Paper text:
The mitoribosome is also decorated with members of lineage-specific RNA-binding proteins belonging to RAP (RNA-binding domain abundant in Apicomplexa) proteins and HPR (heptatricopeptide repeat) families, highlighting the unique adaptations of these parasites. Our results reveal the structure and composition of the most fragmented rRNA mitoribosome to date.
While RNA domains II and III are largely reduced, with a dozen helices, compared to the bacterial counterpart, domains IV and V are mostly conserved where the rRNA fragments recapitulate most of the conserved helices, and Domains I and VI appear highly fragmented but most of the key features are retained. The CP consists of the conserved mitoribosomal proteins [name], mL46, mL59/64, which are found in other species, as well as Myzozoa-specific mtRPs mL155, mL163, [name], and mtAP2-3. Despite the lack of a 5S rRNA, the 5’ of [name] extends out and towards the top of the CP and is tightly embedded in several ribosomal proteins, mainly [name]. The remaining three mtAP2s (mtAP2-2 to mtAP2-4) are positioned on the [name]: one at the central protuberance, another above the nascent peptide channel exit on the solvent side, and the third below the PTC on the inter-subunit side. Finally, the L1-stalk rRNA, invariably formed by helices 76, 77 and 78 could not be mapped to any rRNA fragments in our structure, as the position of L1-stalk remains completely unoccupied by any rRNA or protein structure.
Numbering used by the authors:
A (entry chain LC): 104 to 190, 232 to 262
B (entry chain UD): 168 to 202
C (entry chain LI): 12 to 90
D (entry chain Ln): 130 to 189
E (entry chain LE): 367 to 477, 491 to 560, 595 to 635, 660 to 704
F (entry chain LO): 1 to 344
G (entry chain LQ): 348 to 417
H (entry chain LJ): 2 to 444
Write the structure that this text describes.
Amino acid sequence: VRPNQGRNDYNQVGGKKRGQGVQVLPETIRLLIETRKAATAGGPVGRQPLPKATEATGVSSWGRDRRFPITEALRLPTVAEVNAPWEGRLDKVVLHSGDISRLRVDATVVGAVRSFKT
Amino acid sequence: IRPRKKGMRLDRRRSKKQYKHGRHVGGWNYRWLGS
Amino acid sequence: AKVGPSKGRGPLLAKFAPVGFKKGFGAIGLGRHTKKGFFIINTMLVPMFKVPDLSNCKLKCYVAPDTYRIVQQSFNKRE
Amino acid sequence: NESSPLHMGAGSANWTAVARLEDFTLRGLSHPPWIHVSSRPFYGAGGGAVLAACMSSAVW
Amino acid sequence: RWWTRASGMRNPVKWTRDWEVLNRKVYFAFDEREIRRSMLDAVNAHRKTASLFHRMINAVPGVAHAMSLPGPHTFFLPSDKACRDHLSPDSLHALTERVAFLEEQQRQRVGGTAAAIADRVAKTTEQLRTFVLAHLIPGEWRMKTLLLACGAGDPRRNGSLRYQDTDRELFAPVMYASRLGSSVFLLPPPQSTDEPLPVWVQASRYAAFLPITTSTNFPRFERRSTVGGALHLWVGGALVTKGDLRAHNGVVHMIDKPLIPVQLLAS
Amino acid sequence: MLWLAATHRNRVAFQLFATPREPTASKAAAAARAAAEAVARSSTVSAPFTVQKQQRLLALLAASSSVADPSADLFRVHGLPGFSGFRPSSPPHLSKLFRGRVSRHLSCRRVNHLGRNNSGRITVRFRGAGHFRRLRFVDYKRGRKDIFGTVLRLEYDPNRSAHLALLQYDDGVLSYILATEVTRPGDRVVASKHASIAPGNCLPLGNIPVSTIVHNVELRPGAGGQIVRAGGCYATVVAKDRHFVTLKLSSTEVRRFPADCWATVGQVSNAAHAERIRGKAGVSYWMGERPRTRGKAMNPVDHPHGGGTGKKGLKRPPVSKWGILCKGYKTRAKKKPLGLIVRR
Amino acid sequence: NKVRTDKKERKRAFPQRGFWKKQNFLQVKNNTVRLAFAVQGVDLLKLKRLRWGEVRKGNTGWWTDDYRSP
Amino acid sequence: GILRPRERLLLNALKKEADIRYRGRRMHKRFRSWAQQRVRHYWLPQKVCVTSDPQLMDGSYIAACVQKAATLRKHDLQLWHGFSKRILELADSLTPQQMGYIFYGYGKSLFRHEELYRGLLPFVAEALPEFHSHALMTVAWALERVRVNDRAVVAQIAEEALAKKDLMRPADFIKIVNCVARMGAAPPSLAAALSAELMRVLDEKCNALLFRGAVDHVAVATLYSDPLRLYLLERFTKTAICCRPMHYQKAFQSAVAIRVLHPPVWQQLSKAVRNFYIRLSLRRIPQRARRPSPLHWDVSNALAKLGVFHRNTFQWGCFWIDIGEIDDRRQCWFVDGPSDFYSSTNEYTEANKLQHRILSELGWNIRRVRWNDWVQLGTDMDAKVEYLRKLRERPPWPAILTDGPSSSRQEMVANLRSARDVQRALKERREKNRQPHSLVMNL
RNA sequence: UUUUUUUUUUUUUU
RNA sequence: UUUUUUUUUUUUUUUUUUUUUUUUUUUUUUUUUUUUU
RNA sequence: UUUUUUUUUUUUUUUUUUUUUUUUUUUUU
RNA sequence: UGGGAGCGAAGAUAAUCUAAUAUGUAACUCCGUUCAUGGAAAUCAAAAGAGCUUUCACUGAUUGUAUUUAUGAAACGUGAAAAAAAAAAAA
RNA sequence: AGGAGAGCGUCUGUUGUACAUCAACACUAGAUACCGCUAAUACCACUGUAGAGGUAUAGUAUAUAAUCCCUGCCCGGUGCAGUAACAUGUAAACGGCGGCUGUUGACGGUCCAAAGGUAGGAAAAUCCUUGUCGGGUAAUUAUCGUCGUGCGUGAAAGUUGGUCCGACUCUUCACAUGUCGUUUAU
RNA sequence: UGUAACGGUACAAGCUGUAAACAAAGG
RNA sequence: UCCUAUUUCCUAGUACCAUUAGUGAACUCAUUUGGUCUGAUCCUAAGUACGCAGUGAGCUAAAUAGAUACAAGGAACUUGACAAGCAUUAC
RNA sequence: AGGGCAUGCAAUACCAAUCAGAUAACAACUGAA
RNA sequence: CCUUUUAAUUGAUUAUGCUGACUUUAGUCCCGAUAAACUACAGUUCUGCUUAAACUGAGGAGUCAAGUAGGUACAAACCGUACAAGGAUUAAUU
């Protein structure tokens, strides 16, 4: 039987090694999800007379509700402004880190296939 | 030390006992560098 | 002591020990152990040796002795 | 009195000695003692640029 | 990571070298070996092979209880193939219909027609029990036991089984250029039959080619079954393909022909 | 073997093992009632199973029942020379017991302590390591209510002085039970309050008639027989109460038990276990015994008896190794209040 | 031991009469070496026996000089 | 504890038996090794679903799917045909990389479907300039495996390979050459250029491991010039150690064919070189297990009924013979099949023609039996016997093998379908005769 | 005491 | 009778697990869905 | 042929040792 | 570190033995030393009066505990060194 | 390490000793005492473990020694059991068991006590280092048989012992023999 | 911080850390 | 067309570490020629169709430790039958 | 200090109930430092 | 030099005293079971023991110690020796 006996950790029921293929019940999952969901329950505040800018120029946007935000191209900083100190050339170039799709621009360059099939 | 005896003892480096003396080649009064 | 590093024996090694002692000399892994004693080797973990072309190289290991004087003479011109 | 390197290494080795309620202040040839040994001396008339003094406090 | 880890070929343990003592362990490890599994276990293991039999055993009561006794027994398990190729279509269909009828009766239980059903089941159960039990033979009879019994080991009776040769010039012309240009043994009667069972042996086709690839020391003289082995055992004119299925209750042999009693045999 | 949380229990909220088969519990209740009524219809015997009746049945069973007169010549392995003298007592087809191996799924390895506690010191003196043994899974609780079970064979228990029986239910589940002196391979048993008064049958104390031989009596409701399990032991019914049953044990002790508890009818098997005579110390050596050294042949420091020489005599009472008397000295807590004990 | 660490110097203290000579084994070993060189065709014994400044081409010796009077 | 004397003996004997048994197992195990290698520098990072909607799939998706299916050996008709159908629709939006993958998958799977090859070939032909080493190799490799000769495209492939020699891989270059030689689409000039480039490739960027792959008897005697022949033969000797039976066989075959066809070149070799080959033949070369085909068996039965003794299968030095007569060993028959001819045609393959000519040179009375001619006979034995008898009385085949008449996919399909039922009816009739059916139960 | 494409997982057994 | 082995893995059976998966090495063979048996 | 790795079986760690260096956008060629 | 906290026996003296001294000493664990410890009166004194805490000298080997062997920097008081009640309602 | 008489005696097995040179321990067997489950008992971290995953044909403690043999009297006495809320029961538990005097003496007087050595063995693992008589020898006090006084032992304290058995003392018979008077040669 | 192992140096009670006894010249 | 179905399968150049393959107790110990001799197995052997191993010289003193052969007597020796002897002799 | 500086001393403590280890689901579960 | 001072622990044949050297006993004691031959015209010395086969398609049937003990010029030195694929298809070259 070896002298391993007497220790409280001897033949312990349930372990890290023992349990390697066991998953938590959906109850826990549901609970957690719900808990997280129910953290920002409240009424509206502020003012929203006019709809949020979510469409291209010209075309109006009142009925088309969009859950996702849209970023403006004309509002981004330039490379020169970025690299400027504290107090063609790089005066009209912007290097953006984001979703191209979700960008309001005049034109977008896309790489299509030879057959031009989507 | 036997297996049974060794299974119920901790390491000496786990305690502060190693920083409570001044034994050195010079003598019994050791001063740490940059003291 | 009869047994141990006390007579110029040095640290224990595979050679000087019973069968079963696991001790290498430093290497790089190239696979993994299966559940039956086999070993699947992977070619992905092998290092790559990069060497430029040496078919036409004018340079040599050493420098001609006459170089010293020529280099020196250039200094005096700057004076 | 038999010779057993397994026994020897399992009861009297570097990792087995640390678990011993002994006087570690004594110097040990083949052991990890805890006695301080005063290090490298002061500097004479050599190059000041090549005098080593620290490592674990300076590694970067 | 211990004193010694060598295994397999490099066995640290020391074993006896004496051939005399070694010759005694083989007997104990082969003849006096113990088995935990029963006859039924063995039978079931080959359920795929003998589905008919496997189903009849578990369908008709009585046979299951009979084939679980502590006394030694010998059993024969005919193959589905054998049954199929031996039995006529009408007999095979009739047998399968009655087996299915009994299975349906048991399924109905677990789940003048009433009077007629009792008579039909009573007659069919007895017929199938009689059919089934015919194979069972008291006592333990091994393949070697039978072989030896048949005079396979007697030098005075091995004349037609030891010396065998064939035309080597026709099968190995390159290696031969100069040539170019038994008794019946009676077994105890079955449980449900009084008639004995004759058993004999025969020489295989393969046996007539050993000298071409083996060292022979013969003295101076003056369809074919595809099953392997030098010798073929015929138990009542049924060939045995497999045997020596030792168990806790006895032995099981697979035969290539279903044994049918005279009581069931037609005129 | 099992964990403390898995083995330790004070309070029990159940006295039966239910295995419903219908889709709905409403149908299962009706099925259980139907099964109970079916067992009640079959039950026919209600007289007490007395010693005299036991005797009379044993005489019939062991006088004329056993007659086969078989052809043992063919029941043997042909062509097996066997050992050079070593032969079994009897063949497997004529032995009392089963000539085989215990079930693999109904047994486990035995942990030998050698009479040593956790501290590692010797606690129990004269404790050896004999032949290897396997722990048996004996079903002490008759949870299976309203169901019949037939006996297949009888097994040997090295750990017990009595024989076992391989019980098989109609559903085909195998289980071990404590056998009896009457029970033979083929006999059927059932556990239910509506069952008849027959050997093997398990019924409540209250339902059990007066002056009835019983065994495997449980202490608490649905706990298992603990008071009588050994071979040749049995208890008797003396009196009866609305909530208590008076029982006479094997030690001539009168005690009251709950009316709710279960009990078996009959006598434990292997009644003649106390008749064997060991011919040599080899039997004790194999059984797992060790030599016993008397204290008389010890030093004074080792044993009080040491040094002092003397025969039977009458002056100085003997003293054990522990410094405690061992002749007529009661060992029981006087403060411990007597419970259901009537007459001690 | 080559390291000279064991108690093998104890017996040597006492005087002795003589010691074994593994001539049988040594002879065999020498013979095997001789054979291994002979198959190639070089004489080892000859070279191990010739006088310091002595020249003897082939299988020749004192005997050779006998008949070679001229 | 302690054990019974009886049990002790049995346990010890059992234990001993175990040892004996274990000793007795590793006998034939010679070539095994605990260590092994697995190729992993080809799988894609992206995850796909084979069981997905083909419509939602794209070129990239489909390409991945095809290869994953092949690797997992998920041979499903229902699955593969949907892939083919979607591929046909998306044929106009396939990258060279994707195409190659598709091809590799198909080839590895051995999915015999000409309808897709024929449709994907033209698009490959247009994208040849943008093709790469891997794509180029996979195309040809797949084509070769599926046995669909295309001299119009295969040649172009080779030419593009030669153009991109500076960027190609030695292995792919070698495989291209091999494929080309087997398909027989290289004119003399192309052959010459290929040979010249191959020699430099082999001598500059080839090792022991890579060199072995350049050994091919069919290629050697039909593509390779004398200067490359000699170098190949000489380097094989040196690189023989690091070889396999598969390469050994090929080498031997090469030697034999060279000797038989090109005496001059053979004599031009050195003594040492010659000795190698001389000694090689004496060694026992392992071979895979072989057995007669159903066609083979039918032919053999007809022949035996005609009353002629012969053999089923046997080896003759370096070449296998279908049928060999015992009365006249000189005689030999060969049973062809669909695989013996190119897809939709009856043209013999280069290996078949080379083996025919080598034996004809060596003096073997060689006869050939086709399958499309045979099938027509149906399940009649007298017609087959007469068919065989009429052939026997006629002279043997010429040294130089010729091709058969024209054919078509339609005809091929028809023939196949027809034969399908014959092979089943004959089996049923054969199997039924074995059943005695004598036993009659009263019941 | 596990033998040749790697993992997870269920019953029986010479 | 002093009442004796089984888990990793192999084989068989039962299946809706998974590139954590078998050469892009090679041979042989009449051959395989839906609107050719 | 062993050792290595799963199980027996144990951080009952054999100092300067390992399939073990930060844990997959890997540029599939 | 003979500093502080927990626990803490014996050899020895009493010419053996109990208390007692040794000694709250030795071993074990912990704090880590003037940037510490301590502390600004419900104290001491007695019929006057001193005025947080801390070091040295004398009073004094006096008083007291013990006894067969010892132990005891006692309290008030005097001299001297160093001197310290509170920065303060917020912005 | 053989033939025969006789004393002692469960060995096989473990080991060098409780005096005078000649031992112990263990054991087949029987018998007594405690204990009804969270058992008794043991270790002595105390809601623990062993006992035991057992259940009065079970567990543990003490003493004796063959499978059988007939196996004596005594509770005044320490202790335990019981309770008049200090009778009575336990000797197979617990120390042991005798004076004067009268006729070889069945018998008679008297003192004391709970009871007053039973039978058997008996010159002894005990008194005495020569008790009477018989067997052996040219001599026997050594030793066997026997008598039962000379002193004395003493019954589940283990006495006696039929048959069988023997690395246990002793008597006695037979072969060879430098043990020998008494010593030689290689 | 203090030390042990391996490697180099001239194999060493020193030095040293595969860059293992030095960069000294940024127009 | 009378086979138990006429169901393609040699073998991918291969990570790190251990190793003196034979006789011999080769282990603690040490008065250590490693290896011969001292005991059972492993070879159907006229001892294996030549295998392993073998260390200064001289000399009639006596005594001691042993071997072989002793006339007649045969326990007269010794506390004791300790020791020694018998167990091979026409072939 | 221009540059470089393998490996070992078992390290989430530049923080935080205690009790094995890469520092342990409650409870079982206990403690002079 | 004289004179004053010195807490130097300041004084030797001996505690079988501690640490070393060197005499006497004292050219005393101690020496392991079996050797011989290598010539002046050919050859096989005696003895003890008896697992001494190295491809036959099969890794010689195992473990452990030696902290590398049968390599090497009549060397206790220096210098070497551990290949699981057996590299010499080295059947050729000269």
